[PDB]
């Protein structure tokens, strides 16, 4: 029922290789709809979903100049953070930025986000109150102070509670058949003998959306978490997701193990046995 829009930015310095690499992507729930690549020839915001390409040139021109502004902004951050950590010019470093908004079942504002990362580590993050910042190290304390004096959280809160959710509601309406759908997972179970006394029972979940799903193995009602091989939800390439969980079952006890699937598309949670 709840929905969310997310923008992800990744800036990677390329020492001795020219300008830094900038890649920006946009997501509505688990569906990507826009992209930008600093190495691409178009140098424009490009559609990545069938429901967003219909937007006129005013939309794409506005998104293009803004994502190019973010590219220039992050390029300055690469030098600013280098000076904060007293680093050289030959080192390749990565800056990551994510912000967006979440809405509830009533499509009303729920949560806002705006956080940064440097070389895979948390740097600065807007707290839930949308008025304070969490700075990990001392270098991020400098950024928090500059953002406090410039009142960056005030303008960000206006965007997260306004423009973000207003267009998060707008994309949901234009892509109702794509974003407002709920595809129940197609489930099936697989059996393979590893020896004459052990067999692997694999529970499959296919063609479901959103990606949030839970596959658990139970033996007579007891959770087999430590013995369950559970892969992360993976994209199929068509807008749907996949996931499976496997357990090693001694030959003859297949009737003792059950698979449980929970997803928004299912009217009731499923219980799967090999029978």
């Amino acid at each position: 029922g709840s929905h969310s829009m997310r923008y992800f930015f990744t800036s990677v310095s390329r020492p001795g290789r020219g300008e830094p690499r900038f890649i920006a992507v946009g997501y509505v729930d688990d569906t990507q709809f826009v992209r930008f690549d600093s190495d691409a020839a178009s140098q424009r915001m490009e559609p990545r979903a069938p429901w967003i390409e219909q937007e006129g040139p005013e939309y794409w021109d506005g998104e293009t100049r803004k994502v190019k502004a973010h590219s220039q902004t992050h390029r300055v951050d690469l030098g600013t953070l280098r000076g904060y950590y007293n680093q050289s010019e030959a080192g390749s470093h990565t800056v990551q930025r994510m912000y967006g908004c979440d809405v509830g079942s009533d499509w009303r504002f729920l949560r806002g986000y705006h956080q940064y990362a440097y070389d895979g580590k948390d740097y600065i993050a807007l707290k839930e109150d949308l008025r304070s910042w969490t700075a990990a190290d001392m270098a991020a304390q400098t950024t928090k102070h500059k953002w406090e004096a410039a009142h960056v959280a005030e303008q960000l809160r206006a965007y997260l509670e306004g423009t973000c959710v207003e267009w998060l509601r707008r994309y949901l309406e234009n892509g109702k058949e794509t974003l407002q759908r709920t595809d129940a997972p197609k489930t099936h179970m697989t059996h393979h003998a590893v020896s004459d006394h052990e067999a692997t029972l694999r529970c499959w979940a296919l063609s479901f959306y959103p990606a949030e799903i839970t596959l658990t193995w139970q033996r007579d009602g007891e959770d087999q978490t430590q013995d369950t091989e559970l892969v992360e939800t993976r994209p199929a390439g068509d807008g749907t997701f996949q996931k499976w969980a496997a357990v090693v079952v001694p030959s003859g006890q297949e009737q003792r193990y059950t698979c449980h699937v929970q997803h928004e598309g299912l009217p009731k949670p499923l219980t799967l046995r090999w029978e």
Partner: peptide, 9 residues
């Protein structure tokens, strides 16, 4: 839609 504020670290 993206944000238009130029937020610098």
């Amino acid at each position: 839609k993206l944000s238009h504020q130029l937020v610098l670290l």
